[PDB]
Amino acid sequence: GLSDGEWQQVLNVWGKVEADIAGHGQEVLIRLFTGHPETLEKFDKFKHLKTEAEMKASEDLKKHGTVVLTALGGILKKKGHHEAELKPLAQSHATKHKIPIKYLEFISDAIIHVLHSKHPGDFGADAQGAMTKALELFRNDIAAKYKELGFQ
Numbered sequence: 450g451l452s453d454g455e456w457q458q459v460l461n462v463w464g465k466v467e468a469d470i471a472g473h474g475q476e477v478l479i480r481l482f483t484g485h486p487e488t489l490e491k492f493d494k495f496k497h498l499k500t501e502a503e504m505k506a507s508e509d510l511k512k513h514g515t516v517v518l519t520a521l522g523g524i525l526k527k528k529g530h531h532e533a534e535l536k537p538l539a540q541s542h543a544t545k546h547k548i549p550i551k552y553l554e555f556i557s558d559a560i561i562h563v564l565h566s567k568h569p570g571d572f573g574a575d576a577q578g579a580m581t582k583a584l585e586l587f588r589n590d591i592a593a594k595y596k597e598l599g600f601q
């Protein structure tokens with residue numbers, strides 16, 4: 450649950466992402482894959498990537514980064530009223546991709562890391578607080594659907 454002022458911070462930060470969605474999406478996935486190499490094994494189309502240089506050179510990884518952040522941005526713009534947008538993603542990630550909630554924690558922290566890396570000194574403590582709360586809400590509502598499905 451976020452206040453109006455917190456949502457305003459989230460959507461202000463998101464403007465930074467929308468200026469370069471592919472570059473942000475690429476770096477988020479690279480941070481996930483290099484920090485948590487077990488996550489790469491869930492992607493049949495990226496498991497061939499052995500080095501970060503190959504990851505950086507992969508145009509399909511940048512494409513998928515655009516898909517991921519476009520979906521997340523659509524959810525964030527609903528300011529919590531995201532049941533219709535979130536349900537299909539919860540279902541596909543639990544039942545088809547088999548993504549444990551832990552990996553959603555990993556990618557949430559990766560987003561925070563990338564924002565500081567690309568905007569050092571321009572991602573203030575209030576903005577980090579609000580973005581963190583928004584990603585916690587996203588993860589918590591996914592977790593509720595995971596529990597319904599019995600997925601661990």
Ligand code: HEM
Nearest residue numbers: 488491492493494516517520521538541546548552553556
């Ligand atoms: C912010 C969190 C995430 C968002 C918004 C997101 C979004 C998406 C979307 C929109 C798709 C394509 C449609 C679909 O299959 O539902 C997708 C596919 C997929 N996601 Fe995610 N995802 C997220 C996190 C993760 C994480 C953490 C993992 C694994 C560590 C993951 C694994 C996958 C896989 C394996 C696919 C299929 C890729 C393919 O072969 O095309 N997702 N995701």
